[PDB]
Design an enzyme around this catalytic site. Structure first.
Site, PDB file in Angstrom:
ATOM      1  N   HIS A 161       2.214   8.858   1.593  1.00  0.00           N
ATOM      2  CA  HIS A 161       0.811   8.682   0.279  1.00  0.00           C
ATOM      3  C   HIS A 161       1.544  10.288   0.032  1.00  0.00           C
ATOM      4  CE1 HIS A 161      -1.431   7.063   4.235  1.00  0.00           C
ATOM      5  NE2 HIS A 161      -0.144   7.753   4.402  1.00  0.00           N
ATOM      6  N   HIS A 216       4.808  10.421   6.608  1.00  0.00           N
ATOM      7  CA  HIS A 216       4.229   9.932   8.048  1.00  0.00           C
ATOM      8  C   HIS A 216       5.820   9.260   8.569  1.00  0.00           C
ATOM      9  CE1 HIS A 216       0.401  10.292   7.066  1.00  0.00           C
ATOM     10  NE2 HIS A 216       0.606  12.046   7.090  1.00  0.00           N
ATOM     11  N   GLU A 243      -3.213  13.549   2.751  1.00  0.00           N
ATOM     12  CA  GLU A 243      -4.185  13.097   3.766  1.00  0.00           C
ATOM     13  C   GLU A 243      -4.231  14.281   4.296  1.00  0.00           C
ATOM     14  OE1 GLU A 243      -2.657   8.759   5.247  1.00  0.00           O
ATOM     15  OE2 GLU A 243      -4.022   8.400   4.582  1.00  0.00           O
ATOM     16  N   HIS A 296       6.939   6.458   6.382  1.00  0.00           N
ATOM     17  CA  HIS A 296       6.671   6.276   5.209  1.00  0.00           C
ATOM     18  C   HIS A 296       5.550   8.238   4.290  1.00  0.00           C
ATOM     19  CE1 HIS A 296       3.091   6.001   7.547  1.00  0.00           C
ATOM     20  NE2 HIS A 296       2.400   6.202   6.717  1.00  0.00           N
ATOM     21  N   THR A 328      -4.812   5.818   9.004  1.00  0.00           N
ATOM     22  CA  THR A 328      -4.975   6.005   8.092  1.00  0.00           C
ATOM     23  C   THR A 328      -5.631   4.619   7.080  1.00  0.00           C
ATOM     24  OG1 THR A 328      -3.601   6.648   6.659  1.00  0.00           O
ATOM     25  CG2 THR A 328      -4.727   8.069   8.028  1.00  0.00           C
ATOM     26  N   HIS A 353       0.552  -1.620  -0.073  1.00  0.00           N
ATOM     27  CA  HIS A 353      -0.068  -0.069  -0.100  1.00  0.00           C
ATOM     28  C   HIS A 353       0.771   1.149   0.001  1.00  0.00           C
ATOM     29  CE1 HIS A 353      -0.194   0.241   4.206  1.00  0.00           C
ATOM     30  NE2 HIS A 353      -0.037  -1.296   4.390  1.00  0.00           N
TER      31      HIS A 353
HETATM   32 NI    NI Z   1       0.229   7.341   6.674  1.00  0.00          NI
END
Ligand code: NI
Length: 258
Positions: free
Chosen positions: A94, A117, A104, A92, A196, A62
């Site tokens: 997003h 994050h 996010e 990581h 999340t 992901h």
């Molecule tokens: Ni995250």
């Protein structure tokens, strides 16, 4: 089937397997800068990452996680709104399929091209697994990425992505210093929220930095080359792995600055 970010298994569907998806303290949220309350009692954050030991980078299907040795107090976060010491376990990102989306959290509805994050768990709970079951078990530091100038400190990360292209691939990734990803200012917003991605547990104190870091177009371009799928499976680019903003409900966003 299993959750993802597609039309059939995307964020709008997660509630069926993870009812907490419609919880009272879900993340991310939009940060309304004019409604956040300056709180003079919040202390400055304390980031001690000089003893950080990175070990590996992994494509978990992901996103990509850079993992650290958390067997000891090597890379810790404290201060700010936190009680106790939080150990860094991984970081990581997003990101989006285009430069105009990918973060996010949003600020006054503005979306950034990506969001970093840094995940930490509360040492009082003894391990990550126990920490996620507590309201104050994790602390995540969120940094926005905008496209402009290249970020030198991110390049080592960019360069290993070819080797973890598909789900389940991993690569040794030692001697990476996460201090190279911090903006100059540590001013932040904070609110109580959750993970999340499933299981969406409401165990996170979020610390979102006001100042974004800049990455080059070419840098973000390499992120978009990763795959959600495993090797030998049909190619699905890892893009848009971000959950949309959730209702604030009964929460106050506090600012460490005015
Ligand atoms: Ni995250």
């Amino acid at each position: 089937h299993h959750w993802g970010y597609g039309k059939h298994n995307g964020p709008e569907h997660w509630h069926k397997d993870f009812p907490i998806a419609k919880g009272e303290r879900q993340s991310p949220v939009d940060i309304d800068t004019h409604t956040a309350k300056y709180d003079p009692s919040l202390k400055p954050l304390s980031v001690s990452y000089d003893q950080a030991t990175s070990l590996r980078i992994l494509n978990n299907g992901h996103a990509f996680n850079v993992e650290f040795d958390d067997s000891q107090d090597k890379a810790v976060l404290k201060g700010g709104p936190l009680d106790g010491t939080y150990r860094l376990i991984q970081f990581h990102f997003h990101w989006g399929s285009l430069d105009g989306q990918g973060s996010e959290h949003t600020v006054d509805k503005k979306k950034y091209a990506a969001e970093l994050h840094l995940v930490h768990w509360n040492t009082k709970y003894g391990d990550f697994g126990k920490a996620v079951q507590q309201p104050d078990g994790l602390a995540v530091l969120g940094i926005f990425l905008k496209v402009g100038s290249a970020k030198p400190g991110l390049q080592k990360v960019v360069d290993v992505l070819d080797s973890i292209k598909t789900k389940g691939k991993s690569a040794d990734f030692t001697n990476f210093d996460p201090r190279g990803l911090l903006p100059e200012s540590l001013d932040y917003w904070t609110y109580p929220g959750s993970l999340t991605t499933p299981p969406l547990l409401e165990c996170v104190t979020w610390i979102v930095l006001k100042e974004p870091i800049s990455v080059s177009s070419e840098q973000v371009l390499k992120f978009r080359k990763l795959n959600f799928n495993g090797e030998g499976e049909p190619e699905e680019l890892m893009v848009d792995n971000w959950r949309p903003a959730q209702p604030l409900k009964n929460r106050q966003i506090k600012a460490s600055f005015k």
